[PDB]
Amino acid sequence: IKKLSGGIRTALAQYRELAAFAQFASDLDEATRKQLEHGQRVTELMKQKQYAPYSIADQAVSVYASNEGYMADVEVKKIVDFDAALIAYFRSEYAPLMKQIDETGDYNKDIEAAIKAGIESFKATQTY
Amino acid sequence: ANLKEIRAKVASIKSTQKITRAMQMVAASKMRRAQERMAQGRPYADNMRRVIAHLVQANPEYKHRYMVDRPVKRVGYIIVSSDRGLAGGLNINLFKKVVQHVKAQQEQSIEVQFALIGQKAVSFFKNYGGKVLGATTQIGDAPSLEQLTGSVQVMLDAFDKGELDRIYLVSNGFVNAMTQKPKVEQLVPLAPAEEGDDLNRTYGWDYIYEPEAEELLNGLLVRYIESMVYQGVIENVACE
Amino acid sequence: LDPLVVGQEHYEIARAVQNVLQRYKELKDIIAILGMDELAEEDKLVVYRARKIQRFFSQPFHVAEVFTGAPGKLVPLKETIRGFKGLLAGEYDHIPEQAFYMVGGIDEVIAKAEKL
Amino acid sequence: LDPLVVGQEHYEIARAVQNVLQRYKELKDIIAILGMDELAEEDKLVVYRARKIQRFFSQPFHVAEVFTGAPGKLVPLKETIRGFKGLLAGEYDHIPEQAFYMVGGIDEVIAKAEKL
Amino acid sequence: LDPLVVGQEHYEIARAVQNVLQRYKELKDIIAILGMDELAEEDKLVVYRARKIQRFFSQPFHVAEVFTGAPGKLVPLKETIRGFKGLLAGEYDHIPEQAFYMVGGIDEVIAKAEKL
Amino acid sequence: ATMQCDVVSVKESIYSGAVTMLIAKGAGGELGILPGHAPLVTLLQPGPIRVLLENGTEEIVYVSGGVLEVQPHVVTVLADTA
Numbered sequence: 001i002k003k004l005s006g007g008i009r010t011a012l013a014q015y016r017e018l019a020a021f022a023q024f025a026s027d028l029d030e031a032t033r034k035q036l037e038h039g040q041r042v043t044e045l046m047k048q049k050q051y052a053p054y055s056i057a058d059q060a061v062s063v064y065a066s067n068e069g070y071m072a073d074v075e076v077k078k079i080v081d082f083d084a085a086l087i088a089y090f091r092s093e094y095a096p097l098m099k100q101i102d103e104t105g106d107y108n109k110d111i112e113a114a115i116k117a118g119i120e121s122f123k124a125t126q127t128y
Numbered sequence: 129a130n131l132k133e134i135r136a137k138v139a140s141i142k143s144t145q146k147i148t149r150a151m152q153m154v155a156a157s158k159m160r161r162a163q164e165r166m167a168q169g170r171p172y173a174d175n176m177r178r179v180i181a182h183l184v185q186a187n188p189e190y191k192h193r194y195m196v197d198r199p200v201k202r203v204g205y206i207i208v209s210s211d212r213g214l215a216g217g218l219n220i221n222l223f224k225k226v227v228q229h230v231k232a233q234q235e236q237s238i239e240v241q242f243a244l245i246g247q248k249a250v251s252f253f254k255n256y257g258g259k260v261l262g263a264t265t266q267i268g269d270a271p272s273l274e275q276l277t278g279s280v281q282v283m284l285d286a287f288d289k290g291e292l293d294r295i296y297l298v299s300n301g302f303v304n305a306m307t308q309k310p311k312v313e314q315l316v317p318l319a320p321a322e323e324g325d326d327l328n329r330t331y332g333w334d335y336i337y338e339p340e341a342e343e344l345l346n347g348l349l350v351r352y353i354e355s356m357v358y359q360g361v362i363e364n365v366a367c368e
Numbered sequence: 369l370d371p372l373v374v375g376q377e378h379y380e381i382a383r384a385v386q387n388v389l390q391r392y393k394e395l396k397d398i399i400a401i402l403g404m405d406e407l408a409e410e411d412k413l414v415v416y417r418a419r420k421i422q423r424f425f426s427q428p429f430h431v432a433e434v435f436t437g438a439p440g441k442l443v444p445l446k447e448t449i450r451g452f453k454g455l456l457a458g459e460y461d462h463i464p465e466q467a468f469y470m471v472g473g474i475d476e477v478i479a480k481a482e483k484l
Numbered sequence: 485l486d487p488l489v490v491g492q493e494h495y496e497i498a499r500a501v502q503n504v505l506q507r508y509k510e511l512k513d514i515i516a517i518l519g520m521d522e523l524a525e526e527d528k529l530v531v532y533r534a535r536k537i538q539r540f541f542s543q544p545f546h547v548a549e550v551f552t553g554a555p556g557k558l559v560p561l562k563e564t565i566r567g568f569k570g571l572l573a574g575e576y577d578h579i580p581e582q583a584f585y586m587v588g589g590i591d592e593v594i595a596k597a598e599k600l
Numbered sequence: 601l602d603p604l605v606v607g608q609e610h611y612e613i614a615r616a617v618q619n620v621l622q623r624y625k626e627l628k629d630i631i632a633i634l635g636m637d638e639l640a641e642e643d644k645l646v647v648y649r650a651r652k653i654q655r656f657f658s659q660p661f662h663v664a665e666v667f668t669g670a671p672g673k674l675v676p677l678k679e680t681i682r683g684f685k686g687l688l689a690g691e692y693d694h695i696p697e698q699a700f701y702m703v704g705g706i707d708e709v710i711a712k713a714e715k716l
Numbered sequence: 717a718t719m720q721c722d723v724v725s726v727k728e729s730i731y732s733g734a735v736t737m738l739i740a741k742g743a744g745g746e747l748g749i750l751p752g753h754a755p756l757v758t759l760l761q762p763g764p765i766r767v768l769l770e771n772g773t774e775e776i777v778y779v780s781g782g783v784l785e786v787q788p789h790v791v792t793v794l795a796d797t798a
Contacts, residue, residue: 020147020149020150021150027154027157027158028157
């Protein structure tokens with residue numbers, strides 16, 4: 001979590017610093033428009049229901065998926081969806097990995113590779 | 129009085145400040161884009177000026193009906209303005225310059241018919257009066273020649289019939305990214321000022337004029353008129 | 369107001385209506401100072417739907433007949449749920465705002481749209 | 485200040501002056517935030533007339549000569565009425581507002597107009 | 601920071617440095633809003649000297665030795681005055697800006713620049 | 717040989733150089749290797765123009781008619797977009 005939180009913190013700060021530019025989106029260049037879209041996706045990702053706590057592993061998977069480009073394809077209003085879908089695809093096909101992550105909390109190359117492979121498989125096959 | 133309303137007013141002014149900063153940046157981007165577009169377009173105008181000088185020195189004996197100089201009667205004007213406000217009041221400057229010029233023209237006892245292409249002119253300057261044959265509006269940022277084609281074409285056609293003699297155009301002159309000034313120009317008689325170009329360097333052969341002797345010049349003249357009005361419009365856009 | 373008490377459609381409709389109204393609330397200052405024209409199409413749609421919703425919440429009362437002279441009304445829950453869902457879907461965009469005033473239901477809105 | 489006490493013209497002139505000044509006072513925010521150009525022509529006329537009126541209400545005193553050195557002035561009532569009637573009528577729209585400062589009468593304003 | 605207490609040249613150098621920093625601050629927004637271009641040479645020199653001063657203001661500390669390993673520095677006032685006077689004169693206009701970062705004195709700057 | 721061949725319609729500039737041969741309708745195909753003589757001007761036909769610079773480099777450009785100017789060492793085309 002300590003490794004993965006900084007990216008979303010920077011994204012939230014960048015979205016806060018420029019927010020009035022939403023209506024003139026076509027006017028800005030590619031980089032600032034990408035920053036705006038990433039900020040919108042991140043700020044919609046933080047929404048959550050009640051009486052539904054998230055485990056460490058679920059937060060880690062969501063933040064890792066957001067930090068890369070896997071969240072760029074999905075539509076902004078569909079960010080709340082596909083998140084529970086990705087979490088539910090896990091915990092049933094990758095139970096040992098989340099058991100290990102929840103129990104230990106360690107981070108290495110193998111865990112990152114497994115998370116990347118699982119996210120790729122979900123994006124390739126499943127639907128939301 | 130109440131502190132809560134004062135706090136709300138402070139918050140509202142803060143929001144207005146933020147949105148106005150955003151508009152300032154948007155204007156920066158648009159101004160740079162307009163500057164580069166018109167810089168790209170300028171060499172074509174320079175080439176066409178070179179070619180019109182070339183042809184007028186080639187065959188100066190034959191003059192078209194636009195090279196005419198009939199006595200001043202029923203002059204015309206061209207007004208280019210903006211489609212929206214918040215422009216620092218350059219449109220009012222152009223309108224006041226045109227109003228003083230047309231006051232002088234009326235002192236010379238000449239009625240005026242002019243074409244308006246700026247939305248502020250047709251929406252406001254029309255409210256008092258004035259005969260207008262072309263009132264194009266909502267041309268948008270960086271329009272095309274098709275968007276503004278017939279507005280000056282019909283006025284030139286009326287000039288050909290003899291009902292018009294002088295045609296004026298007025299806009300804002302781009303001198304610095306921070307400063308601009310109104311301009312007044314006369315274009316219909318194509319009066320020559322610099323005719324010494326290419327006289328001292330060769331060009332003693334001219335052209336044989338195989339397709340037509342002196343007939344094709346009308347098309348390039350109308351193209352020239354379109355080019356000048358288009359470049360004036362884009363200059364006004366950048367100044368805005 | 370809870371998904372497990374009133375259901376699923378009711379909660380979503382109420383939340384969407386509140387979201388639209390709150391979004392429209394934040395556009396007062398910009399229009400007040402700057403012209404309404406300098407806005408995106410989505411904002412204009414939002415403000416139009418917000419005005420329609422804002423004046424759709426008014427209905428005549430039975431005991432307040434003496435003040436205005438109009439007869440009272442009593443709208444069931446299904447009718448208002450259906451009307452708000454239809455209005456929020458995207459239709460009813462050509463009907464003027466004046467049909468949404470002391471009207472009662474939604475079929476009454478459609479009937480009133482003929483005159484004014 | 486009663487139409488049966490001071491007359492019909494006096495009351496009307498005073499009311500018009502107060503109305504013009506009050507209308508000018510309400511525009512202090514738009515000119516503060518936006519520029520001067522973002523107003524209708526009528527508001528600009530109101531602002532200019534109010535500034536000229538504000539300048540025209542100042543006159544030198546006999547007692548205050550030691551502070552400044554200019555000789556004092558005395559103005560009859562009918563001159564004041566005539567001057568304000570002319571100012572509100574529409575004339576004096578070409579005289580700069582710098583000529584309305586500590587002049588006394590209105591013919592003195594006209595004479596001073598050619599100096600400053 | 602007045603000439604009577606600390607002398608004349610110290611005051612002059614301090615105010616000159618502050619003036620250069622203020623000019624850079626007021627030009628930063630112009631650079632951001634329009635670009636590094638469309639500017640003459642004195643402003644570019646001001647920008648470069650301001651960047652050099654900004655880097656030169658930093659220095660290592662004794663209490664950070666056990667973390668980084670770089671030795672601490674105790675630069676005296678004279679050396680600072682000499683270095684800043686030389687920088688403002690324009691002598692060190694060719695040294696890369698990286699040599700000024702977290703180095704300490706001025707001969708250290710020269711040595712670090714020579715090493716690069 | 718050929719040094720330059722410029723065609724500008726509204727705001728677009730083209731690049732040329734060492735043109736082997738040029739094909740156009742209404743001109744007889746004389747365009748290409750610059751003759752270096754007989755300056756002339758023509759009303760350009762709206763047919764597309766094929767340009768072949770060298771070593772068989774074939775690229776195609778379309779114009780909608782206009783005025784063509786040809787002269788020793790100076791060839792300029794002033795066409796219309798529509």
